[PDB]
């Protein structure tokens, strides 16, 4: 009917945000804890969120179009709740092995190969069940066993199998500083799959996310699960205009086309407002358009830690700003016309400054206060500072020749340890091209 | 008689601000047939797509107002379909007294321009999405020229669509809504109808973009048609022919940037004229 | 007060009415339904038009059923072994021929008839005059008239020829069990296969016609005959 | 009326599955556990209660038209129950001259010969009450002593005695592997008689059947009794068109006549979706007409493995789709056109279509629901593989020379089992032949 979407949830983090996400939509679209409609919702007309995101048993019991993969822990949390019956249990797959993922890529990967058949069956079934399949959204972790390893296989399989449909990923990058020594190795290996196998990647940096969660929301003891609440909020709102009819410019394809004009850039950073309105005991008050644009540039208040210098004076390849609520557009348009002219980023005279703006409202299936809000989606060169840091740690583990061992024992790394070297070299090329892009030199002129 | 509800329905179809999905899927079927001018068979197919859509939505009622009362029309030849299309309304009762000839014509026109923007955008996106993938690239500079021109065109159309929707539609609708609530009076509906016929009528006078734009779309259609072929001496010769085509398109686009600041691009007008007679 | 007090117990008598006499009883046959008061002064008139229409439809159905019973009977008799490699060859051919006609019959009933009557009944249930009966019947009859005129001019032509060809085989088959019978049987087998191959080609144009709902090519074939 | 059927129940399984069948027909047709009618109008010729599976006494206590052969246990369980009086103690033959089948076919076949007349008397009595006999259904298991031997013996006699009627058997096959090698002896001797003397054989492959029982019913206390409930739901659905002739495009006899391509190919496999509860939680799983339509095409719930669920590279000889529950007809036709066109089954060089579907509604004597179900019964050329396996096992066993003594007394098997050697050549000619029919040589001139 709609351009239906399959969400794939992998890893602890991917399963935690993915479960929360369904919980927010169920509240928003006035349905139960198993998508059971209330009496005024069995009336004529509601928002057309339903068929892209959801499917019907057609007794008015909505079900998420979601696939769950992990082992026993995350699945066990879904089972304790009334969110097990909400989600189709065949789309949920749980496996173990006598040598499990263990938060190491190679084990997660070897297992992935064993159940290559199984995952593809699951996927084809859900695809066959689908009418007008638009594409996939992958929700996952690179601090996951599963999300990394099992995830890398699935990304490869999706690449080969179908090239026709769009593949988007929401990838969570670790919170703050190094957790294990081998982290750079785990991270580059997942990152390989993410550059090659996907058309578009939205990076969600936990460090940045965590700063907001600890400080704004206030968590005396913070955790990943707590931070994930923010991420499920960012992802859900970004889909609000898709799920809200009157928009068809909100559209995945037109957005993609405008944002991504070669497969070499495709790492997105989001920025966000509000992060206020939780546990009401402080003031909550409406911002305006200028205030909204100005907050977004700040590093730890924005969702992504790209390690920028001086709060993004860095080269923007493209900017889309999405404003939520009713507010005079005109006031903004003049101010925006001046903001491009001052030019906050950098640019070359070899390409125009392309700035896009989207306006989106709020659902009338739930009450609103019409507070000034926004999300921004931009493609920026500054993310590369992170990649350089990963590359440095990666070079250093290689050089020592030590702690290469745990990966090396698996057969894939035993036959060739050439593969890591080839990726490092490639990865230096991806960084080199992004640097060339800041200059005029980027095109034939 | 529940006037209020029907007014919303009208804002949906006639204004067309909540029929997006349908226009997209209507365009996808019979894409080739619409590119060309009317042929007899074109018509049979076009009418089928119409009969199918009349089955697909509205089940909020025993009798579909939208689907039944409103059908879309094609003019017979044997230039392009796009011109030949018009939108037609079959009248109700007692609601028919309200509606007037002028009003239906005003709405049919916003629908046509809207529709025009919409087909071009779909086509611009499908081509790009393809190009981002491996098979079209790599068996050097020429690649880079196609990439830049494509990014720029997508930008241009998205800026157009923002202005067309905000500055025209969003503005007039905002006003329409006020006028009905604030004064709830019969006089208020008559006032509002007059408001609905204006601003589209002013906008018609202010903007007269489409013939130029359309020239550039045809060059775009040709460009993209070529790009879809993917993978010697022949390529290079053909590339050369494309290259002059690109520079000319690049030079008008360069002129066109000036227009957004202050209207009119002499250069595109001048290219058609030159072609008329140099 | 179900059948005893029904239209079938009370109402039917068998009638003989036919233009001429054949060499068969089958053609000659008709069926008679006894007086019903809705129509005791509405068709009791100088024209019994309503009863003639219904009859027309009744016949078209009846010929299809008569051939259908014969096709099952013919096939069943053969499973017996009457009426080497040759045995398997005939057995597949017979079944295939039966399969296409049968499939065709499925589509006529299901797609036209069952759907039209269903729609009619619901539309009566959802909501009283004599006219409403007539209207719903009329609508049924109209859809069938349109279908009749375009498809069913070749299609019954083809179906009647298939029926003859199966009788000719069945007849041959009983005879087999010397030499003369085998020489005749081989000739007859070749012949059924050429006629099948030509039918298969038409069948394909016809499959396309069911898919478009009415393709061009069938249109052409019917126009050429005409 | 409708053409009567006699069920022969052989072995443990047939008798068990038969008891369950009767409860299911008895409920559905609003009659007692003694066949006694339901007193207010529950049946005014809205349905025709099936004189093929029933006979009417003139107390109007309906009785099943069935012959049970086995020993004492299964018959005793019915007789304990209030299900007696929907029994006939005359139809019931209990071995007291069996003296251990031993898991040997010959032993079974032979006891059957010895008590041919008393057995033939039950059958003839049942034949004599008949109006016009459609045919027989044989319910049994293969690899049994009883299930194998006595059923084969009866079948060959029936073949000769009444040559103008239909013989169907519902046969439980073991697996496409072996842990017990003398399975193969039981199965090869029986198989000759089943191939020639049955005009149709419905294979239920016990491995596959087990998967359904284990996966779906999910009780750890599971046995054959529990499993037999899954065979009875399946068997009852196939019979819908006979028991209800009031569907004027589904009538069983004519359907049977058409589908059969010739008895050369006649091993049929079922598949079914979804499932009704019998030993597990209620079916609350509702899904769309489109969903329903998709599910019928998947053989992912394998209730039989005759090698049509492993792979499909040869061709399907016939496919019949059984729909139960009315649901919008217009929709049912638009989906159906897509299925014939899509061509899910594999095909030969002259057969490219021969797939049929029948639609019937639910009876309202059952609690009303708007869930849809369906069964697939299909004939595929892939079956030859099971014969190939059988031949491997047959060579293996014959190579040990296990238990030739019992065979040697018998004239047939003097120079050791000659019948099995004769069968080995016969089965190879048939298997080659089925392959030629996939290819061009099927029509050659």
Swiss-Prot record, chains A, D:
Any single GO BP term: positive regulation of cytoplasmic translation
Superkingdom: Eukaryota
GO molecular function, one term: microtubule nucleator activity
Region (Disordered): 33-56
GO cellular component: cytoplasm; gamma-tubulin ring complex; gamma-tubulin small complex; inner plaque of spindle pole body; microtubule; nucleus; outer plaque of spindle pole body; spindle
Cell location: Cytoplasm, Cytoskeleton, Microtubule organizing center, Spindle pole body
SMART domains for the chain: Tubulin, Tubulin_C
Binding residues for GTP: 143-149
Swiss-Prot/TrEMBL keywords: Cytoplasm, Cytoskeleton, GTP-binding, Microtubule, Nucleotide-binding
PROSITE patterns assigned to the protein according to its UniProt record, in alphabetical order: TUBULIN
Basic and acidic residues compositional bias, start-end: 43-56
Function as written in the Swiss-Prot or TrEMBL entry: Tubulin is the major constituent of microtubules. The gamma chain is found at microtubule organizing centers (MTOC) such as the spindle poles or the centrosome, suggesting that it is involved in the minus-end nucleation of microtubule assembly. TUB4 is an important spindle pole body component that organizes both cytoplasmic and nuclear microtubule arrays.
Protein family per UniProt: Belongs to the tubulin family.
UniProt miscellaneous comment: Present with 7200 molecules/cell in log phase SD medium.
Assembly with partners or alone: Interacts with SPC72, SPC97 and SPC98.
Designated name of the protein: Tubulin gamma chain
Gene assigned in the entry: TUB4
From Swiss-Prot, chain B:
Top-level taxonomic group: Eukaryota
Cleavable signal peptide: none
Subcellular location field: Nucleus; Cytoplasm, Cytoskeleton, Microtubule organizing center, Spindle pole body
Quaternary structure and interacting proteins, as annotated: Interacts with TUB4, SPC72 and SPC98.
Protein family membership: Belongs to the TUBGCP family.
Additional remarks: Present with 2230 molecules/cell in log phase SD medium.
Known function: Involved in microtubule organization by the microtubule organizing center, the spindle pole body (SPB). Probably part of the microtubule attachment site at the SPB.
This protein's name: Spindle pole body component SPC97
UniProtKB/Swiss-Prot annotation, chain C:
Subcellular location: Nucleus; Cytoplasm, Cytoskeleton, Microtubule organizing center, Spindle pole body
Note: Present with 56 molecules/cell in log phase SD medium.
Similarity section: Belongs to the TUBGCP family.
Complexes and interactors: Interacts with TUB4, SPC72 and SPC97.
Task of the protein: Involved in microtubule organization by the microtubule organizing center, the spindle pole body (SPB). Probably part of the microtubule attachment site at the SPB.
Name of this protein: Spindle pole body component SPC98
Gene that this polypeptide is encoded by: SPC98
């Amino acid at each position: 009917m709609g351009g239906e979407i399959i969400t794939l949830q992998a890893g602890q983090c991917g399963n935690h945000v993915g479960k929360f996400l369904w919980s927010q939509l169920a509240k928003e679209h006035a349905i139960g804890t198993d998508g059971l409609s209330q009496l005024p919702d069995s009336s004529t007309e509601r928002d057309d969120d339903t068929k892209p995101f959801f499917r019907e048993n057609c007794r008015n019991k909505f079900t998420p179009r979601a696939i769950m993969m992990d082992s026993e822990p995350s699945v066990i949390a879904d089972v304790e709740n009334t969110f097990r019956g909400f989600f189709d249990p065949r789309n949920t797959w749980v496996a173990s092995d006598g040598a499990s993922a263990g938060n190491s890529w190679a084990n997660g990967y070897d297992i992935g190969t064993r159940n290559q058949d199984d995952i593809l069956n699951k996927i084809d079934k859900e695809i066959d069940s689908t009418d007008n399949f638009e594409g996939f959204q992958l929700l996952h972790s690179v601090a996951g066993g599963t999300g990394s390893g099992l995830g890398s296989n699935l990304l490869e399989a999706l690449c080969d199998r179908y090239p026709k449909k769009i593949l988007t990923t929401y990838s969570v990058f670790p919170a703050r500083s190094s957790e294990v020594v081998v982290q750079s190795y785990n991270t580059i290996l997942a990152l390989r799959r993410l550059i090659e196998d996907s058309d578009a990647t939205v990076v969600f940096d936990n460090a940045s996310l965590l700063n907001i969660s600890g400080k704004v929301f206030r968590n005396p003891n913070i955790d990943l699960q707590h931070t994930n609440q923010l991420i499920s909020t960012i992802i859900s709102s970004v889909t609000n205009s898709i799920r809200f009819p009157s928009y068809m410019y909100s559209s995945m394809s037109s957005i993609y086309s405008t944002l991504i004009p070669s497969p070499e850039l495709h790492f997105l950073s989001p920025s966000f407002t509000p992060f206020t309105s939780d546990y009401i005991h402080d003031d909550i008050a409406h911002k305006c358009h200028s205030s909204y644009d100005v907050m977004l540039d700040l590093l730890d208040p924005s969702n992504s830690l790209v390690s920028t210098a001086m709060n993004n004076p860095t080269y923007f390849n493209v900017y889309n700003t999405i404003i939520g609520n009713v507010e005079p557009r005109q006031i903004s348009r003049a101010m925006t016309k001046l903001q491009q002219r001052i030019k906050f980023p950098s640019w070359s005279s070899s390409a125009m400054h392309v700035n896009i703006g989207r306006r989106s409202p709020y659902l009338p299936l739930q009450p609103n206060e019409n507070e000034v809000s926004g999300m921004m989606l931009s493609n920026m060169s500054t993310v590369v500072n992170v990649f350089e840091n990963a590359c440095n740690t990666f070079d250093k583990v290689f050089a020592k020749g030590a702690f290469l061992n745990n990966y090396n024992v698996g057969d894939l790394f035993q036959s060739m340890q050439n593969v890591q070297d080839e990726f490092a070299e490639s990865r230096e090329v991806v960084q080199s091209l992004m640097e060339d892009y800041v200059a005029a030199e980027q095109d034939s002129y | 008689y529940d006037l209020i509800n029907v007014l919303k329905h009208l804002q949906q179809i006639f204004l067309g601000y909540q029929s997006g999905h349908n226009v997209l899927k209507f365009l996808t079927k019979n894409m080739g047939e619409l590119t060309k001018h009317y042929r007899n068979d074109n018509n049979a197919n076009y009418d089928k797509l119409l009969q199918n859509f009349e089955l697909e939505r509205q089940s909020e009622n025993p009798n579909n107002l939208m689907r039944q009362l409103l059908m879309i029309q094609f003019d017979t030849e044997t230039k392009s379909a796009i011109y030949h299309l018009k939108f037609d309304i079959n009248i109700p009762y007692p609601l028919n007294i309200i509606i007037s000839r002028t009003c239906m014509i005003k709405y049919q026109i916003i629908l046509r321009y809207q529709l025009v923007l919409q087909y071009h955008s779909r086509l611009l996106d499908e081509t790009w999405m393809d190009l981002n993938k491996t098979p079209s690239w790599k068996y050097r500079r020429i690649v880079r020229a196609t990439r830049v021109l494509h990014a720029k065109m997508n930008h241009f159309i998205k800026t157009i669509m923002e202005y067309f929707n905000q500055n025209v539609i969003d503005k007039e609708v905002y006003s329409l809504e006020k006028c009905y609530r604030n004064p709830t009076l019969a006089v208020a509906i008559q006032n509002e109808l007059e408001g609905g016929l204006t601003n589209i009528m002013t906008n018609r006078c202010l903007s007269d973009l489409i013939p130029l734009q359309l020239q550039i779309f045809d060059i775009v259609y040709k460009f993209c048609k070529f790009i879809k072929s993917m993978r010697e001496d022949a390529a290079l010769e053909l590339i050369q022919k494309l290259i002059e085509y690109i520079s000319n398109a690049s030079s008008i686009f360069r002129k066109c940037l000036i227009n957004f600041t202050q209207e009119l691009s002499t250069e595109k007008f001048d290219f058609y004229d030159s072609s008329s007679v140099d | 007060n179900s059948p005893r007090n029904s239209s079938v117990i009370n109402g039917l008598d068998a009638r003989v009415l036919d233009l001429g006499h054949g060499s068969v009883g089958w053609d000659v046959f008709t069926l008679d339904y006894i007086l019903y008061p809705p129509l005791s002064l509405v068709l009791n008139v100088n024209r019994p038009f309503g009863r003639k229409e219904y009859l027309r439809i009744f016949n078209f159905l009846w010929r299809f059923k008569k051939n259908n019973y014969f096709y099952q009977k013919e096939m069943l008799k053969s499973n017996d072994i009457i009426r080497i490699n040759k045995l398997s060859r005939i057995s597949i051919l017979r079944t295939q021929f039966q399969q296409f006609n049968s499939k065709m019959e499925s589509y006529y009933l299901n797609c036209i008839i069952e759907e039209n009557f269903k729609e009619m009944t619901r539309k009566l249930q959802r909501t009283l005059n004599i006219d409403e009966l007539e209207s719903v019947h009329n609508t049924f009859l109209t859809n069938i008239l349109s279908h009749k005129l375009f498809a069913t001019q070749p299609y019954p032509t083809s179906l009647v020829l298939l029926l003859n060809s199966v009788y000719e085989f069945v007849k041959v088959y009983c005879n087999l069990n010397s030499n003369g019978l085998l020489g005749k049987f081989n000739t007859n087998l070749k012949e059924i296969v050429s006629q099948y191959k030509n039918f298969k080609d038409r069948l394909y144009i016809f499959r396309a016609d069911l898919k478009n709902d009415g393709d061009e090519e069938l249109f052409l074939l019917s126009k050429s005959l005409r």
